[PDB]
């Protein structure tokens, strides 16, 4: 779901105010800026050496992670550059002393540095309002597959 071209749209895609000097003869790939979101969260090497842009990247973009940290399960990875996470919980009805299974759908913005798919449990972090509904940035794909790490059977 990611275009091969590093910039695909009409506007140019650059990290604002990080400049690579063309007159210089170092001729490294580019000058890519990055940061660590803290909380003992490892920045992915796919973001470290990657070539995407993703204005709203917790690791490379301007957005900062602060506030709530929510763990959930991916219910929809199939809309562009964003994720829909199913968070399940038990509401405690006290008149019966009984619990009640309930679910909420939290939109978030997964960076291209992560490879997500339906069913992955994801640790996500609070940030600024990114869109009308997304307020969280995907920070870790804990379960990449879960039960699909081993697929084939060849003794």
């Amino acid at each position: 779901s990611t275009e091969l071209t590093v910039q695909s749209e009409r506007a140019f895609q650059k990290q604002p105010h990080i400049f690579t000097n063309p007159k210089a003869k170092a001729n490294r790939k580019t000058k890519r800026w990055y940061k660590n979101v803290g909380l003992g969260f490892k920045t992915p090497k796919t973001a470290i050496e990657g070539s995407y842009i993703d204005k709203k990247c917790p690791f490379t973009g301007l957005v900062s992670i602060r506030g709530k940290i929510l763990t959930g399960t991916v219910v929809s990875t199939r809309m562009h550059r964003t994720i829909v996470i199913r968070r399940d919980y038990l509401h405690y009805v006290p008149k019966y002393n009984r619990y009640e299974k309930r679910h909420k759908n939290v939109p978030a913005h997964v960076s291209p540095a992560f490879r997500v798919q339906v069913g992955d449990i994801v640790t996500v972090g609070q940030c600024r309002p990114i869109s009308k509904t997304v307020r969280f940035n995907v920070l870790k794909v804990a379960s990449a597959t879960g039960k699909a790490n081993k697929q084939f059977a060849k003794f």
Partner: protein, 188 residues
């Protein structure tokens, strides 16, 4: 009267929210500046908490910066050639942020001449020794020399004339220019 609150929008689910708390003053939105070229005419607007804002409609000259050697000069904007949002602004010569314009480019030219003196487009001993110590490091790339011979520089504006009132930006240079000229050749 143009509100920017979220109440008039439908909910994430899609329900039509009922009207509530008729829109306030801390939620207002003002008219677009849709600036033009020529006969500088900046109108002050008194916004929230004082803080004079400046609408910069009809702006002709502004500061522009060169990143390679890092030098800024006041120069004239001469039309807009590309806009990443809407080509309608390009046809109407509406100047907003991130628009791509042409530059008279003379001030950069004789700054280069008094700085390196390579005679693009085709003394005291102190200046001669400065140039000798420079030792022709001014190996600036070929396309900028091409439009120097043409005489009009390709620049991308970076200031917001709608808010700041200025007309500041930077010249396209390096792969930047590359990208956009492809787009321009798409237009051509």
């Amino acid at each position: 009267g143009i509100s920017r609150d979220s109440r008039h929008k439908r909910a994430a689910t899609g329900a039509k929210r009922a009207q509530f708390r008729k829109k306030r003053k801390f939620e207002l939105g003002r008219q677009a500046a849709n600036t033009k070229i020529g006969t500088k005419r900046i109108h002050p607007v008194r916004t929230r908490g004082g803080n004079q804002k400046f609408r910069a409609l009809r702006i002709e000259t502004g500061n522009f910066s060169w990143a390679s050697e890092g030098v800024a000069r006041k120069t004239r904007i001469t039309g807009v050639v590309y806009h990443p949002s809407n080509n309608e602004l390009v046809r109407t010569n509406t100047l907003t942020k991130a628009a791509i314009v042409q530059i008279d480019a003379t001030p950069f030219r004789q700054w280069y001449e008094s700085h390196y003196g390579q005679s693009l487009g085709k003394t005291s001993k102190n200046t001669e020794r400065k140039w000798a110590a420079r030792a022709a490091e001014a190996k600036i790339e070929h396309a900028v020399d091409s439009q120097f011979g043409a005489g009009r520089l390709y620049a991308a504006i970076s200031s917001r004339p709608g808010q700041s009132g200025r007309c500041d930006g930077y010249i396209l240079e390096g792969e930047e220019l590359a990208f956009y000229l492809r787009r321009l050749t798409a237009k051509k």
